[PDB]
Scaffold this active site. Structure first.
Site, PDB file in Angstrom:
ATOM      1  CB  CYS A 144      -1.032  -0.082   1.003  1.00  0.00           C
ATOM      2  SG  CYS A 144      -1.998   1.412   1.365  1.00  0.00           S
ATOM      3  CB  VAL A 218       8.686 -20.713 -15.616  1.00  0.00           C
ATOM      4  CG1 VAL A 218       7.200 -20.317 -15.683  1.00  0.00           C
ATOM      5  CG2 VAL A 218       9.322 -20.706 -17.063  1.00  0.00           C
ATOM      6  CB  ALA A 292       7.859 -13.651  -1.331  1.00  0.00           C
ATOM      7  CB  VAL A 976      -6.169  21.259  -5.488  1.00  0.00           C
ATOM      8  CG1 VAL A 976      -5.051  21.674  -6.417  1.00  0.00           C
ATOM      9  CG2 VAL A 976      -5.945  19.742  -5.211  1.00  0.00           C
ATOM     10  CD  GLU A1155       3.244  18.980  -1.545  1.00  0.00           C
ATOM     11  OE1 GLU A1155       2.863  20.032  -1.179  1.00  0.00           O
ATOM     12  OE2 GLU A1155       3.634  18.473  -2.301  1.00  0.00           O
TER      13      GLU A1155
HETATM   14  C1  LIG Z   1       8.271 -12.023  -6.307  1.00  0.00           C
HETATM   15  C2  LIG Z   1       9.088 -13.089  -5.850  1.00  0.00           C
HETATM   16  C3  LIG Z   1       9.569 -13.394  -4.480  1.00  0.00           C
HETATM   17  C4  LIG Z   1      10.369 -14.294  -4.043  1.00  0.00           C
HETATM   18  N1  LIG Z   1      10.650 -14.328  -2.809  1.00  0.00           N
HETATM   19  C5  LIG Z   1      11.540 -15.225  -2.317  1.00  0.00           C
HETATM   20  C6  LIG Z   1      11.962 -15.559  -1.116  1.00  0.00           C
HETATM   21  O1  LIG Z   1      11.652 -14.713  -0.215  1.00  0.00           O
HETATM   22  N2  LIG Z   1      12.529 -16.537  -0.581  1.00  0.00           N
HETATM   23  C7  LIG Z   1      12.917 -17.615  -1.444  1.00  0.00           C
HETATM   24  O2  LIG Z   1      13.456 -18.546  -0.912  1.00  0.00           O
HETATM   25  N3  LIG Z   1      12.456 -17.642  -2.689  1.00  0.00           N
HETATM   26  C8  LIG Z   1      11.629 -16.506  -3.201  1.00  0.00           C
HETATM   27  N4  LIG Z   1      11.347 -16.359  -4.354  1.00  0.00           N
HETATM   28  C9  LIG Z   1      11.800 -17.711  -5.202  1.00  0.00           C
HETATM   29  C10 LIG Z   1      10.474 -18.615  -5.452  1.00  0.00           C
HETATM   30  O3  LIG Z   1      10.350 -19.120  -3.968  1.00  0.00           O
HETATM   31  C11 LIG Z   1      10.585 -19.865  -6.265  1.00  0.00           C
HETATM   32  O4  LIG Z   1      10.905 -19.150  -7.666  1.00  0.00           O
HETATM   33  C12 LIG Z   1       9.841 -20.932  -6.204  1.00  0.00           C
HETATM   34  O5  LIG Z   1       9.773 -21.897  -5.227  1.00  0.00           O
HETATM   35  C13 LIG Z   1       9.702 -21.924  -7.464  1.00  0.00           C
HETATM   36  O6  LIG Z   1       8.691 -22.595  -7.382  1.00  0.00           O
HETATM   37  P1  LIG Z   1       7.934 -22.804  -8.826  1.00  0.00           P
HETATM   38  O7  LIG Z   1       6.841 -24.235  -8.865  1.00  0.00           O
HETATM   39  O8  LIG Z   1       6.901 -21.645  -8.886  1.00  0.00           O
HETATM   40  O9  LIG Z   1       8.795 -22.829  -9.938  1.00  0.00           O
HETATM   41  P2  LIG Z   1       8.376 -23.228 -11.564  1.00  0.00           P
HETATM   42  O10 LIG Z   1       8.380 -21.777 -12.262  1.00  0.00           O
HETATM   43  O11 LIG Z   1       7.232 -23.968 -11.630  1.00  0.00           O
HETATM   44  O12 LIG Z   1       9.557 -23.921 -12.092  1.00  0.00           O
HETATM   45  C14 LIG Z   1      10.273 -23.482 -13.074  1.00  0.00           C
HETATM   46  C15 LIG Z   1      11.608 -24.404 -13.359  1.00  0.00           C
HETATM   47  O13 LIG Z   1      11.550 -25.488 -12.349  1.00  0.00           O
HETATM   48  C16 LIG Z   1      11.615 -26.727 -12.929  1.00  0.00           C
HETATM   49  N5  LIG Z   1      10.920 -27.590 -12.211  1.00  0.00           N
HETATM   50  C17 LIG Z   1       9.740 -27.062 -11.334  1.00  0.00           C
HETATM   51  N6  LIG Z   1       9.367 -28.038 -10.566  1.00  0.00           N
HETATM   52  C18 LIG Z   1      10.125 -29.428 -11.023  1.00  0.00           C
HETATM   53  C19 LIG Z   1      10.144 -30.766 -10.608  1.00  0.00           C
HETATM   54  N7  LIG Z   1       9.407 -31.158  -9.673  1.00  0.00           N
HETATM   55  N8  LIG Z   1      10.959 -31.609 -11.248  1.00  0.00           N
HETATM   56  C20 LIG Z   1      11.762 -31.077 -11.983  1.00  0.00           C
HETATM   57  N9  LIG Z   1      11.993 -29.894 -12.532  1.00  0.00           N
HETATM   58  C21 LIG Z   1      11.130 -28.896 -11.931  1.00  0.00           C
HETATM   59  C22 LIG Z   1      11.150 -26.368 -14.292  1.00  0.00           C
HETATM   60  O14 LIG Z   1      11.692 -27.413 -15.349  1.00  0.00           O
HETATM   61  C23 LIG Z   1      11.600 -25.151 -14.522  1.00  0.00           C
HETATM   62  O15 LIG Z   1      13.012 -25.332 -15.085  1.00  0.00           O
HETATM   63  C24 LIG Z   1      10.582 -15.536  -4.983  1.00  0.00           C
HETATM   64  C25 LIG Z   1      10.302 -15.464  -6.258  1.00  0.00           C
HETATM   65  C26 LIG Z   1       9.228 -14.309  -6.676  1.00  0.00           C
HETATM   66  C27 LIG Z   1       8.833 -14.256  -8.154  1.00  0.00           C
HETATM   67  N1  LIG Z   2      -4.163   8.883  -0.184  1.00  0.00           N
HETATM   68  C1  LIG Z   2      -3.508   9.571  -1.045  1.00  0.00           C
HETATM   69  N2  LIG Z   2      -3.063  10.793  -0.384  1.00  0.00           N
HETATM   70  C2  LIG Z   2      -2.241  11.822  -0.839  1.00  0.00           C
HETATM   71  C3  LIG Z   2      -2.063  11.583  -2.445  1.00  0.00           C
HETATM   72  C4  LIG Z   2      -2.289  10.407  -2.748  1.00  0.00           C
HETATM   73  O1  LIG Z   2      -2.077  10.065  -4.267  1.00  0.00           O
HETATM   74  N3  LIG Z   2      -3.177   9.445  -2.411  1.00  0.00           N
HETATM   75  N4  LIG Z   2      -1.181  12.610  -2.862  1.00  0.00           N
HETATM   76  C5  LIG Z   2      -0.392  13.415  -2.210  1.00  0.00           C
HETATM   77  C6  LIG Z   2      -0.038  14.813  -3.060  1.00  0.00           C
HETATM   78  S1  LIG Z   2       1.347  14.768  -3.992  1.00  0.00           S
HETATM   79  C7  LIG Z   2      -0.613  15.870  -2.634  1.00  0.00           C
HETATM   80  S2  LIG Z   2       0.145  17.339  -3.221  1.00  0.00           S
HETATM   81  C8  LIG Z   2      -1.940  16.128  -1.670  1.00  0.00           C
HETATM   82  C9  LIG Z   2      -2.870  16.843  -2.656  1.00  0.00           C
HETATM   83  O2  LIG Z   2      -4.386  16.658  -1.796  1.00  0.00           O
HETATM   84  P1  LIG Z   2      -4.960  17.979  -1.186  1.00  0.00           P
HETATM   85  O3  LIG Z   2      -4.627  19.017  -1.982  1.00  0.00           O
HETATM   86  O4  LIG Z   2      -6.359  17.398  -1.115  1.00  0.00           O
HETATM   87  O5  LIG Z   2      -3.820  18.018   0.021  1.00  0.00           O
HETATM   88  O6  LIG Z   2      -2.391  14.660  -1.543  1.00  0.00           O
HETATM   89  C10 LIG Z   2      -1.263  13.853  -1.015  1.00  0.00           C
HETATM   90  N5  LIG Z   2      -1.848  12.879  -0.141  1.00  0.00           N
HETATM   91  O1  MOS Z   3       0.524  16.630  -6.381  1.00  0.00           O
HETATM   92 MO1  MOS Z   3       2.155  17.826  -6.423  1.00  0.00          MO
HETATM   93  O2  MOS Z   3       3.172  17.001  -5.017  1.00  0.00           O
HETATM   94  S1  MOS Z   3       3.411  17.226  -8.311  1.00  0.00           S
HETATM   95  S1  FES Z   4      -2.391   1.341  -2.308  1.00  0.00           S
HETATM   96 FE1  FES Z   4      -3.438   1.074  -0.499  1.00  0.00          FE
HETATM   97  S2  FES Z   4      -4.821   2.813  -0.405  1.00  0.00           S
HETATM   98 FE2  FES Z   4      -3.441   3.317  -2.077  1.00  0.00          FE
END
Ligand SMILES: Cc1cc2nc3c(=O)[nH]c(=O)nc-3n(C[C@H](O)[C@H](O)[C@H](O)COP(=O)(O)OP(=O)(O)OC[C@H]3O[C@@H](n4cnc5c(N)ncnc54)[C@H](O)[C@@H]3O)c2cc1C
Ligand SMILES: Nc1nc2c(c(=O)[nH]1)N[C@H]1C(S)=C(S)[C@@H](COP(=O)(O)O)O[C@H]1N2
Ligand code: MOS
Ligand code: FES
Ligand SMILES: Nc1nc2c(c(=O)[nH]1)N[C@H]1C(S)=C(S)[C@@H](COP(=O)(O)O)O[C@H]1N2
Ligand code: MOS
Ligand code: FES
Lengths: 1221, 99, 50, 50
Positions: A144, A218, A292, A976, A1155
């Site tokens: 957020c 992948v 994650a 504004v 701000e």
């Molecule tokens: C945004 C994000 C955040 C992440 N944060 C973390 C984190 O905090 N900590 C962490 O440890 N990891 C993290 N990861 C990594 C993630 O945990 C691993 O990529 C995930 O566990 C892979 O699992 P999957 O089944 O999705 O892989 P897939 O995409 O399904 O696997 C792709 C590859 O794995 C092979 N494969 C999969 N299963 C098998 C199988 N059974 N046998 C043989 N080959 C296989 C495929 O052949 C291919 O080469 C993050 C990834 C992302 C995108």
């Molecule tokens: N939730 C939220 N609050 C926010 C923003 C936004 O995008 N979302 N923009 C900020 C920015 S850049 C400005 S300049 C002010 C403008 O709003 P106001 O004129 O009502 O104070 O909102 C601020 N607070």
């Molecule tokens: O919304 Mo202004 O701080 S460019």
């Molecule tokens: S992304 Fe949560 S209120 Fe804007």
């Protein structure tokens, strides 16, 4: 056939393309649009969706959340998909989760609430009476940019002390024939085996097909890297792949078991059998509770993580030390190999064949006298990929100190998981004492020989983290060994808060398709100063979709490129995916040019004066010379740049539906591009998803080319960007280079100040100098400086042009002055608190730009925060804690704030409006201010309801336009709300002026009667409102005037706790007070305060922009951008709002925030600074420290110098050109 | 304005009225179409009065604008409408009139 | 304040397009509200004259 | 090029309405049926006050 359920309705697909994902399918086809495109890469968590799957054996259904932006269509056969629109709606019964997340004011922008309400719903389904720990665990993945998360936990705090699965799904699961499914396409083939045997067969077939199980590893490769797989394979519910077994060899877990199931099984098993048998389970749980998010943990499984070969893997080093063996199976039999360096180095001898799916993995019981521990460090506490992690275990046996087994493995350091072998080969034999640590350090320091070419940077940081983790291992094992021996002023719910939490809010892309639409996508330059000689577009033209590849030859790059991310060509296509595919294969010829400028220090004046610095410097006691660098920022507005342009076919009329902040620029640029008078081109907004600036210039040029395309080819054109090229096209804050030479007397008071501000502008030769002017003024918040000589310059670079931001310049110059103050307070010998008190403004004073200020408010909030937060007892407890701890330094800080509110010229403040009353009691109001999250429209409704006495029901607002209210201003400056509210005031006053007789003749009736009678007697009922805005004058030739309408006054105290071994920090308690007046809506005010504080803390601590030496910015990887998450909040944030003051020209005695609280986020910043000093207080070294911004954990760990940093190989500077500048 | 075009030629009348009263050519004015979001509570387009009725309303709105543009044209002899409009933008002169 | 009517032009309506267009539009809007999609209504010449 | 009410583009998922008039000036309605009418291919609903 594809058969599943969405929100309880059966959905059938035939003849599909499996190369298409789920989220674009839910938007552009099935049209339950309450699910948002946040990032497409799994980081954001906006696309949370509940998935329920029934097991025909267990006779039960398992519910789990998941990110729909990575889920493919062809993995849902037989699963229930539930979005935000299935739990409750504004027509039917609303579910208590949305009711309580809107009642508790948990919504500001509404572009994050559907995913979060689905997360809380999913946990309530799985868990009837949860704990706050479980709720916060569930919401960890979700992000957020606006709220700061506090009201969401507030709404969750009341839970702690019905939808039905379709019967068709459970009956066809109870049947469950041995159906192996094929989903075909012209490009990519998909195979899905329901049986183990067919999976083994298709793997024994063409083996270049990945075994997709979670798509989490992948999906990024096929997306950002762009690799394509002609054929892929994906299993079904196979029991062998998912089974838990207990045996004398510990336990056996299937490769198909997701990480969340793994975590639950480990958590239950560690409570059954004695801890003398369990050491590696606890390490796995420790790294599983920090992985994650719950979405990814329920999307990803054991086997995919093991075989993914990601160097940053959080679970591999724990396995690579714990004696683990992978079981395999294929057409040519069975196998059982061990997992060690040979498995991860990619060498052929120890590994998997092009066949042999990984079937399972076994984790043995930990032996007695054997202990396992794992440590990691990343940019953020949660949901951040580590930069160094380690798996460590040592087995002694027989109750001695001699090393007979010692396994330590390091991940995130080199190209793969590196495990120490020769040092492990030599450490054997000696006792568990200091000498083995010396031996291990002296070996592993040069055994893992890194270079200046190490990707990700932070060379010395990782080098220090290695020995830091080893040292932690030493202390923990030694410890266990030693042990065993008028609605104004009332809190009113947001207008569309429910409409957010129930997913009815329309956005600039949620609106439907119009006939014969198109789509546009750009191609961006990736070179800094490179001449273009030729472009290859023969092969790009010929593919399905391409209409014309628009170039600069007919606002785009003509001959040379001066910045990366510059627009050179755009592509026209019949659909989005076709447009992206066509763009991805246009080839440009380049020749790089010699003079390359990327930094300020190697690339007109704006100067304010006050007094004479020279005489004081001749007089003053101590002269200080100091310097600072502050890096920029990125907005990370959640909604991306979405727009549509519609030609009319008659009179060259051009509608432009764009989710911008400034429709006047859009209309102007489209008119000038099309060669049209502005009376033909109209612009439309309804709401914008959390934009904090930056949606002004680049939105203008994007709309320009989009409208050009929509005109020349005579068809509608949609254009939506993605997060990566959103960063690459649009810049951010100006980073500042600040030098200062100050003079202070022994009374610790500053009487001499020279400033030379430098900004990093961008490639634009004629740019927005204004911040250099504007930020020049706001340099000092609360401190009286008798003399100033302050100059500023703007430096061009081969980089995308930088824009404004929330806070807008005050945070930068304010922290430059604050840092000069703090270094003076360090050089003096008195506390920074005293230095700030005896430098703080009087009750009445005069600014250096000659303007009277009255500031008893600041002194009163100073006293209130100081006395009602128990400052003295807490501080003395802080020094007591630092006097009985050596690696845990806690730091406490306080910071004031004066923020000026005002604008530049005469034209800037004017604000219009239009108000109708129809012949019932019902009012339609419209204005020129843009809704983007602040809650401006709720304030407008309250204004109209007080000025006409009708209840809040009768008023409705229907978005904004340039056909109703023309020539509005920028929707920024935090005014504004006030400006358009004054315009609404004027309109409503005109209407109540028009109707004295009817009302005063009719005492006890309704607005129905009086509006009827007003029509009867021929009285106008629609009026234009208008406000001229405040008068603002600034002269630079004299540096004097009245450019600021007023000032807001606040104070913030912050307590943190940093660790000297691993360079991270905690946030314990922040107490924050501000003076606002008689607030229009207290809840909106407190929400804006919290959000600004969180954004400032994030800028000052976390967020960094790493640039390649050729100018290419990095979006994902080790150095990817982070924003604060749910665990970065202070444990307690007690915020109180002070009594009003009844100000003069502020609307209804209320002040304009939005701000203001950003710079108060430096509080925690200086808090960690304090802690670092205590470390150097106890280390006995008082050497010079230069702490820049942001204070990443790298520089915090560098500041805590030790014997570890004294034994790090210093690489030569001019040896290699590293990852980042 | 709040009157419907049904082929009688009322919008050409309105553009002629605006062209004569604001002293700008025919080509420099536009008109989109009737709606109840901009001009509320309009009356039925029946009686042969609606053309003259809305002509008088358009005259009224034009006059309210031209009195505000009095000083600007007072201080500029030969101004294209862009020059006076941008000036009136600078001195904070309103440019949205209800007739 | 929720219902907005739009009339860019009319093709030669020589009086009388008021009560009957209203009775068409009332049930057209009823249908459009009950089934959440747009509803377009065009009348035949015989339906008009009847 | 003059855009009329029917000349607007098709909007997504819009239905279509057609009316069923009367044929007898003064009469009494005894019963109404729609079974063949509602079971046609394309019908979404029939609106009647019955
Ligand atoms: C945004 C994000 C955040 C992440 N944060 C973390 C984190 O905090 N900590 C962490 O440890 N990891 C993290 N990861 C990594 C993630 O945990 C691993 O990529 C995930 O566990 C892979 O699992 P999957 O089944 O999705 O892989 P897939 O995409 O399904 O696997 C792709 C590859 O794995 C092979 N494969 C999969 N299963 C098998 C199988 N059974 N046998 C043989 N080959 C296989 C495929 O052949 C291919 O080469 C993050 C990834 C992302 C995108
Ligand atoms: N939730 C939220 N609050 C926010 C923003 C936004 O995008 N979302 N923009 C900020 C920015 S850049 C400005 S300049 C002010 C403008 O709003 P106001 O004129 O009502 O104070 O909102 C601020 N607070
Ligand atoms: O919304 Mo202004 O701080 S460019
Ligand atoms: S992304 Fe949560 S209120 Fe804007
Ligand atoms: N071409 C044309 N002329 C027309 C009509 C029309 O629909 N088309 N309507 C007639 C009717 S009924 C009236 S009352 C007037 C309305 O025009 P006015 O009210 O703008 O004068 O136009 C008359 N002449
Ligand atoms: O007076 Mo005629 O437009 S029914
Ligand atoms: S988490 Fe799905 S788009 Fe980012």
């Amino acid at each position: 056939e594809l058969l599943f359920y969405v929100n309880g309705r059966k959905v059938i697909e035939k003849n599909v393309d499996p190369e298409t994902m789920l989220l674009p399918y839910l938007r552009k086809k099935l049209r339950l649009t309450g699910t948002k495109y946040g990032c497409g890469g799994g980081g954001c968590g906006a696309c949370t969706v509940m998935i329920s799957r029934y097991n025909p054996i267990t006779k039960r259904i398992r519910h789990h959340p998941a990110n729909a932006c990575l889920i493919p269509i062809c993995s849902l056969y037989g699963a229930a998909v539930t979005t935000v629109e299935g739990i409750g709606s504004t027509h039917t019964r609303i579910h208590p989760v949305q009711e309580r997340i809107a009642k508790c004011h948990g919504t500001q922008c509404g572009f994050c609430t559907p995913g979060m309400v689905m997360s809380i719903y999913t946990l309530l389904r799985n868990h009837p009476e949860p704990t706050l720990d479980q709720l916060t665990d569930a919401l960890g993945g979700n992000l957020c940019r606006c709220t700061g998360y506090r009201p969401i936990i507030d709404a969750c705090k009341t839970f702690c002390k019905e939808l039905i699965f379709p019967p068709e799904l459970m009956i066809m699961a109870e049947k469950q024939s041995q159906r192996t499914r094929v989903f075909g396409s012209e490009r990519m083939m998909w195979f899905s085996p329901v049986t183990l045997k067919e999976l083994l067969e298709f793997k024994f077939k063409y083996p270049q097909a990945p075994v997709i199980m979670g798509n989490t590893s992948v999906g990024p490769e096929v997306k950002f890297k762009g690799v394509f797989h002609p054929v892929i394979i994906s299993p079904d519910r196979i029991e062998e792949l998912s089974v838990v077994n207990h045996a004398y060899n510990g336990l056996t877990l299937g490769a198909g078991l997701s990480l969340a199931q793994v975590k639950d099984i480990l958590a239950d098993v560690v409570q059954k059998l004695p801890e003398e048998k369990t050491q590696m389970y606890h390490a796995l749980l420790k790294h599983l509770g920090t992985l994650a998010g719950s979405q990814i943990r329920n999307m990803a499984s054991l086997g995919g993580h093991i075989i993914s070969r990601h160097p940053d893997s959080d679970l591999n080093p724990i396995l690579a030390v714990g004696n683990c063996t992978l079981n395999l199976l294929s057409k040519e039999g069975k196998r059982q190999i061990p997992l060690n360096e040979q498995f991860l180095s990619k060498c052929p001898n120890a590994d998997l064949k092009p066949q042999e799916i990984l079937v399972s993995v076994n984790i043995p019981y930990s032996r007695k006298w054997e202990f396992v521990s794992a440590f990691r460090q990343a940019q953020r506490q949660e949901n951040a990929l580590a930069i160094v992690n380690s798996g460590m275990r040592v087995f002694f046996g027989e109750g001695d100190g001699i090393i007979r087994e010692l396994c330590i493995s390091y991940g995130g350091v080199g190209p793969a998981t590196i495990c120490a072998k020769n040092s492990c080969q030599k450490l054997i034999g000696r006792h568990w004492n200091e000498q083995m640590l010396d031996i291990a350090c002296r070996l592993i320091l040069n055994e893992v020989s890194l270079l200046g070419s190490a990707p990700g940077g932070k060379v010395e940081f990782k080098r220090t983290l290695i020995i830091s983790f080893l040292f932690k291992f030493y202390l923990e094992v030694s410890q266990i060994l030693k042990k065993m021996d008028d609605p104004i002023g009332h809190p009113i719910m947001h207008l569309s808060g429910v409409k957010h939490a129930t997913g009815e809010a329309i956005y600039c892309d949620d609106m439907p398709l119009v006939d014969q639409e198109l789509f546009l996508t750009f191609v961006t330059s990736s070179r800094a100063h490179a001449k273009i000689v030729s472009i290859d577009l023969s092969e790009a033209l010929s593919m399905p979709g391409v209409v014309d590849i628009m170039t600069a030859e007919h606002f785009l790059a003509t001959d040379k490129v001066f910045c990366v991310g510059q627009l050179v060509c755009a592509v026209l296509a019949d659909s989005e995916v076709q447009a992206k595919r066509a763009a991805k294969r246009v080839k440009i010829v380049y020749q790089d040019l010699e003079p390359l400028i990327l930094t300020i220090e190697e690339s007109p004046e704006r100067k304010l004066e006050y007094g004479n610095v020279d005489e004081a410097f001749k007089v003053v006691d101590q002269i200080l010379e100091g310097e600072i660098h502050m890096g920029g920022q990125e907005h990370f507005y959640m909604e991306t740049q979405s727009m549509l342009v519609v030609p009319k076919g008659e009179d060259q009329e051009m509608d432009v539906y764009v989710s911008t902040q400034f429709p006047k620029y859009i209309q102007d640029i489209v008119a000038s591009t099309l060669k049209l008078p502005a009376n033909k081109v109209m612009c439309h907004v309804r709401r914008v998803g959390g934009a904090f600036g930056g949606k002004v210039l680049k939105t203008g040029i994007i709309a320009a080319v989009t409208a050009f395309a929509a005109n020349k080819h005579g068809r509608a054109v949609r254009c939506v960007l993605e997060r990566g090229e959103d960063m690459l096209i649009t810049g951010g804050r100006h980073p500042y280079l600040g030098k200062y030479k100050a003079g202070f007397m022994n009374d610790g008071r500053i009487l001499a100040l020279d400033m030379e501000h430098y900004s990093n502008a961008g490639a634009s030769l004629d740019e927005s100098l204004f911040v250099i002017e504007m930020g020049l003024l706001k340099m000092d918040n609360a401190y009286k400086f008798p003399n100033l000589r302050c100059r500023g310059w703007a430096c061009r670079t081969n980089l995308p042009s930088n824009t404004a931001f929330r806070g807008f310049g005050f945070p930068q110059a304010a922290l430059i002055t604050e840092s000069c103050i703090t270094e003076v307070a360090a050089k003096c010998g008195l506390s920074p608190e005293k230095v700030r008190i005896i430098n703080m403004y009087k009750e009445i004073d005069q600014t250096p730009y000659k303007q009277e200020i009255n500031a008893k408010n600041l002194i009163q909030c100073w006293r209130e925060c100081m006395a009602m937060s128990s400052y003295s007892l807490r501080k003395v407890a802080v020094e007591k804690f630092n006097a009985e701890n050596y690696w845990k330094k806690k730091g406490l800080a306080m910071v004031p704030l004066k923020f000026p509110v005002g604008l530049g010229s005469r034209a800037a403040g004017q604000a219009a409006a239009l108000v109708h009353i129809y012949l019932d009691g019902s009012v339609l109001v419209t204005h020129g201010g843009i809704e983007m999250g602040q809650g401006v429209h709720t304030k407008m409704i309250q204004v109209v309801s007080r000025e006409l006495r009708m209840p809040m029901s009768n008023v409705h607002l229907r978005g904004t336009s340039t056909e109703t209210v023309p020539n509005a201003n920028i929707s920024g400056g935090s005014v504004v709300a006030d400006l358009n509210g004054l315009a609404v005031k004027d309109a409503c006053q005109t209407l109540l002026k028009r109707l004295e007789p009817i009302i005063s003749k009719n005492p006890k009736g309704t607005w129905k009667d009086w509006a009827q009678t007003a029509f009867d007697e021929s009285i106008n009922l629609s009026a234009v409102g208008y406000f001229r805005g405040y008068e603002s004058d600034m002269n630079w030739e004299k540096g004097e005037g009245q450019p600021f309408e007023y000032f807001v006054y606040g104070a913030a105290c912050s307590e943190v706790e940093i660790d000297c071994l691993t360079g991270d920090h905690k946030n314990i308690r922040t107490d924050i007070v501000m003076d606002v007046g008689c607030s229009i809506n207290p809840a909106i005010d407190i929400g804006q305060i919290e959000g600004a504080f969180i954004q400032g803390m994030g800028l000052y601590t976390i967020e960094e922009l790493n640039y390649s030496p050729q100018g290419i910015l990095h979006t994902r990887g080790p150095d990817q951008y982070k924003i604060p998450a749910i665990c970065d909040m202070p444990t307690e944030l007690h915020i109180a709002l002070l009594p009003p003051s009844q100000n003069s020209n502020t609307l209804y005695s209320s002040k304009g925030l939005g701000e203001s609280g950003v710079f108060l986020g430096c509080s925690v910043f200086f808090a960690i600074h304090d802690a670092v000093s205590a470390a150097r207080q106890e280390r006995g070294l008082h050497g010079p420290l230069t702490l820049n911004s942001p204070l990443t954990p790298e520089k915090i760990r560098m500041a805590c110098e030790d014997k570890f940093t004294k034994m790090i190989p210093r690489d030569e500077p001019g040896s290699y050109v590293p990852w980042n500048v």
